[PDB]
Amino acid sequence: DMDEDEKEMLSEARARLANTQGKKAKRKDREKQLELTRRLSHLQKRRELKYNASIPFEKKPAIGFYXXXXXXXXXXXXXXXX
C-alpha cells in the first residue's frame, strides 16, 4: 500500500507539470476536432452524391505615372492557376 501510494502521487505529479492548457484550451480544441471531423463526413457525402463575391475593401494602387500592359497579362494567369 505505502509503496503503491507513493507511485500514484509520482504519476499524478507528472500530469500536473506537463499540461497548462486549462478548461478553455481543451474545449476550444474539441470544437476544432468536431468541425474538422464533421467536414470529412460531409465531403464524402458530396463525392457520394457526385467575402469572395466582390472583394472586402478595395484600395486602389496610387496613380497613373507609368501601367495598362501589366494588367493585361494578370487576368489570363488566374485562369491558368485554376
Binding site: L17, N19, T20, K59
Partner: protein, 48 residues
C-alpha cells in the same frame, strides 16, 4: 469608417550612430515572478 488622408513626408533629422555597446546597455532581462507565473514555463531554482 473609411481610410484616412494619405500621409506626408517624414523629414527627420539624420539618424544618430548607435554602437554595439549602447544597444547592449539597454538589455532588458525578462523578469520572473515570485507569485504570478501562469501557464507552465518551468524555471530552475538557481534562476530565482
Amino acid at each position: 469608417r473609411g481610410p484616412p488622408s494619405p500621409p506626408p513626408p517624414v523629414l527627420h533629422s539624420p539618424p544618430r550612430k548607435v554602437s554595439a555597446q549602447e544597444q547592449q546597455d539597454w538589455q532588458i532581462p525578462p523578469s520572473i515572478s515570485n507569485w504570478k507565473n501562469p501557464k507552465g514555463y518551468t524555471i530552475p531554482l538557481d534562476k530565482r
